[model samples]
Target chain A: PALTKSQTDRLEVLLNPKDEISLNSGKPFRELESELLSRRKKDLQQIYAEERENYLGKLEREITRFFVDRGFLEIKSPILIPLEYIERMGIDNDTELSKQIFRVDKNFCLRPMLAPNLYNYLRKLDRALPDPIKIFEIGPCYRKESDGKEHLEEFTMLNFCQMGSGCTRENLESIITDFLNHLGIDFKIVGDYGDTLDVMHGDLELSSAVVGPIPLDREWGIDKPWIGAGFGLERLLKVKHDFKNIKRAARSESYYNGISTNL
Target chain B: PALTKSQTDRLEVLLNPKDEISLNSGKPFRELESELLSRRKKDLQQIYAEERENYLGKLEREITRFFVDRGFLEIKSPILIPLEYIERMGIDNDTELSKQIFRVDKNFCLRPMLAPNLYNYLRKLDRALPDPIKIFEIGPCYRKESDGKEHLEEFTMLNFCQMGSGCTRENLESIITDFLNHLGIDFKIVGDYGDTLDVMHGDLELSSAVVGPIPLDREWGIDKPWIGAGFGLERLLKVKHDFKNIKRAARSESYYNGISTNL
Candidate 1:
């Protein structure tokens, strides 16, 4: 049914309100009260939830297949830890890394990253197990914050670490190549440590690639040696739009409704 | 190779003695110079970037699959918003909700929840959105806190909200059950709204059995009705263990590893 004239007028008020108080005074604003009209606002969160499942499920299968094909094992370790240990390590809690951390008897914390747990997992493995530990996780992580476009207070992270006698620089390179190639992303190794290099010469590729390695800085801190890359879903979306030459103006309605309609 | 007694001893001392000093400690330590150590840490991080690439390739594929199979659309939205919008809305800035937020621009924040964005999405639709708007996300979020299990200053979230026509109380129940079931979860619903039962159901079966007439209260705050349920992934993990009768002892074996590691 078409929206009533009053409804349209009320919606206009919603769309062009001069102040907060206007929202309350608008006529029988069928616009604001979802319940007043027989129709209601249903949050089809399952679309997002199920989509997340799809991403995770596919990620697991592909990663497991890739890793297993290359000899990696799936491991489950604790997500919480002793708070004292983190404090004792002298790491600054600068990122507000302490909030969403759930507790185990108030002494431990929810892990902010998987590196430590993976290391711990490796620490316990018997010599008979593989030398390098190549493990990953597809689970929920916690945080504290309000909302915005690319951020959520809680999320899922993908992290893996490999350490073994057989884990050579070549093996690591191949793993990265295989992953990017499989995902249809084109990338080149622009920088290298002295392992196979004739000299510590830098190249233009690092400085000129469409997507390049982040430039290095001299200042650093503890845990600074852990090399990693992160891809935000929102950043990915923007990249997709740019790459695809999408002409439509960016609108929340188009993004959401377009999804519902197309899917 | 095992951590030699001396290495562990030295590492422990280096890690510990810092608390007694300034973070800007320019002095070298007996075992390792703080400056060189921090530099090496950055080098180490650069080295690990390759592994991070491999991990994410797997993670994205798996998470995407989880959503697709369950009929969800993967949506990515913006991270920045007017700060005043957040302040006026009265969403807690210092709660579990607050820990995940990030400032993308001076007046903007990385979004903490997608549901409100989804709501914003709904407002844009010319026609009413379908009975259920199922969606999911696997993205980054930021927050502030000192650290715990299931907590982070930054993390990712997987959210799902289902709204139906008149969105009956029973419909909400079904949505939760269906979502959990799809996620391989077992949970119970305990509340009363409208004709919906006001009792605690046990695990999956009870959630399945509850019916609804879509209850509503005439007042806000005190008389407000809760029409939905949600859980964090880590909490879900722990709950899964408890529900399965897995011994808590099994959960404890890796607490230190989880704690001591940081990103």
Candidate 2:
């Protein structure tokens, strides 16, 4: 029998077919297994073949140094966080976003973003330090969603905020300008999904920036003008590399450096 | 009243005192809290006034590139793993090490090492590829342990193995030597425990290397001669920088760029 629709679909995802896969109608079905596996070996070699295995690790360092050079202290927050932190972000049990939390215990779940910890740091750091404070976190954020070309269950985020004197909109824009320029990419800033700023490259929305002294500041028991921007690192790299799927640039099981690991 | 033993202990872990902490016996206790917070801000600036954020992120990229230069394919494994993978590693319910697993659900737990997924890759990749296959994984692993100078609940690991023709002890030693040399550090290999090789710097044990095609090969049907090594990235950085605590060079909430975040 020829390859079934289910079989063909899976192969297309794993192999990234250049043209059409041969039916091999008369061959033993097991033969197709080895053939695909052999193809995986060739493709991995062709893609990575030499030099760097992937740029995700290096990009993280480059981004880190870029921001650090600009005086943003980096924070490494816990991946597992208390559910109360999520609720504090106005994501109550009633919200659509709350339904996506991967709650492991009654009180704690995997962190959905780098926000809560950053907020906690902001409250403490702002109180202790001088007028201006710049801090950022670059790490993984987890969500409960089906993997797709644009989304994954786990993704890395670069969340940064500056509070106090330098927290003006113009300053935030200057920072983004320098950041995007450093990345050597062309992107447009759009006000999408409410009043906040969204960083866009073509159809892909790479990040969002917001100014604060907003309503949530009351909950944290402080008030300050702040410019905070959160970016999906995988999304940025995905757009840059022109990856067919987000999984190609992710900490993925099916793909390694954009090559299939299904073999 | 003075700062109690419990309060002082926590402060020491947080501040990394250069001299001694003052008891401030005559003052109001609440004053001590803000006083410590001020000191925290000063210490953070003193330590990281201007420079790179921390070496952990950069070290990960450096290590990845080093291995990739030598033809090693990088693998990104899931931090959340099925319990069966742990059992396959020979840590049963009765063992002390198995007790360290952070079991989040009935069958799933945070992975304590990169070995389980690496073994899975070895089996599938070996079957499809040529005689020798090279691969490495660098990511976080979780364990249920008391946070201390040398230990934490979460740490990063670099695990790599070469399977087939070039899987000799000599080849493994050369790899370690090159890796250490690249880091510009001096270290010695000691076979002090159970006939396996351990990389050591002064009193610190950096990593362990083992030769395989051992009994565990039966579990995964992976029976190839192999030389595998697992290194704790925090431990290596801890040794390299002469860090007072492993937490100073970790994915830490308490420390940012080796400066206290307790503020």
Candidate 3:
């Protein structure tokens, strides 16, 4: 299939790869191979000054409230963890997750997922609680990769889990649908879908440049341990506004409503 | 600093260690754990249904809005990387940061921080963009650790970075203070207060807990590497609300208004 002239032009703008030199436009692409060194205090001052207040504070409160309304308790685990645990989970020397686990007191590991910790909490809460225990979290996470697209040594996850009797899969699907609905995204399960439900189970096994089937894993679907589905808040937003560029996933829009056209 | 006899008695109930076993009759702790595992689907269902609308959806929006208001550009990086990158970066066998590195087509590391990738993004810019590139993110970061109270393998991180000749340490501090202040938190600088002036005057050294006095090789403080600060949101909220009595931070986090009995 060939693209039309106008389509090609737009594609060029959006489809263009963000390279080392082309990422933001000051210096040629070069790996920052220099070991950790002294920083210019003034430069750091500017970095701090640039931190701004906009929607996050409100979002934090709103999300927390939402979880509360649904009877989901918020729980947190520590960032540092024992190294032996990491190895027991089969984490190898080459994995990206290994990058953030700074060895501090007791050979700790930085957290990678909330589920395991939630399980621990559940184990603790096993007694004396009611039928269902629901919990949610919004916190920082970490990873280390070199490609430098879609990877942050640290990032945030919005996670929630429940434990108890009478929980159903259909109910989980509804939750996904509801979230997308609330997000106001027009996505219909990637290829051919009706709603977030379609998106979650539809050919998730398929591959896209953003996320897809890879050699090591067969596919990411509902079949495995993760009955729950996660949405890339950034990706969902980008797709909704028809921002073809992949970079838009994390960038901000004027009202937190749509993707940006101007850089 | 002592309390009266009656007050001590009263405080005992408040300060007693948590009993992981079920206090409710006929519900053993082991039985509850089984129930949770058995009902994973149902529990997840209710969580998604309730939490999405009540909270997560809006929280996502607000976080996006916060970054945009400040004119920060968003960047996406890959979650997978080569083993060499991981090893060279000190993301290896012993660290929890090492575990989240999942190998697929090739070895890949989940992102642990936005800065490294953001730096890569800036390098990609190559003189085409303006000075002082600002970036922010809300995404998943992974690490490997033994699951326990207040711990997980994956979680969310809120990351923002400022790059360019103008970025400075003061700018970083201001941003941290401002963000905390906006969150209605009393931000305090707690570090090696004794060497505050000397710390900046010379090179800083940090080490793993295993290697104390931190090897004097690894840099310390925000200015050590790109000037960054992290907030344990759970702790911040607890401090903000003057929450006490919970034996553990995780328990306290669970009691937060967003997740518990709606305050």
Of the candidates shown, which would achieve the greatest lDDT relative to the real structure? Answer: 2
True contacts kept of each: 0.15, 0.36, 0.01
Which digits, one per residue and each the tens of the lDDT, describe model 2 over residues B25-103? 6665467666776677776665346653556776887898888888887787678778988998999899988989878
lDDT, candidate 1, A86-193, per-residue tens: 554444566355544444345655554554554454444322233344454434444454534344443445554454444444655566667656755445664342
- lDDT (C-alpha) at residue A188 in model 1: 61
Q: By the TM-score metric, which is better: model 1 or model 2?
A: 2
Worst 10 residues of 3 chain B by lDDT: B204-213
Q: Model 2, range A54-104, lDDT digits (tens) per residue?
A: 556667778888888888877776788888889888897888778788776
Number of the top candidate by TM-score?
2
Worst 10 residues of 1 chain B by lDDT: B215-224
On residues A214-238, what C-alpha lDDT tens digit does candidate 3 reach at each position?
Answer: 1212221111122233343434433
- Model 3 interface CAPRI class: incorrect
Name model 3 segments beyond 4 Å from true: A1-13, A16-69, A74-132, A136-177, A184-263, B1-68, B74-114, B125-129, B137-160, B164-173, B176-263
Model 2 TM-score, 2 decimals: 0.83
lDDT of 2 at A169: 69
Say which prediction, candidate 2 or candidate 3, comes out ahead on TM-score.
2
DockQ of each: 0.09, 0.41, 0.08
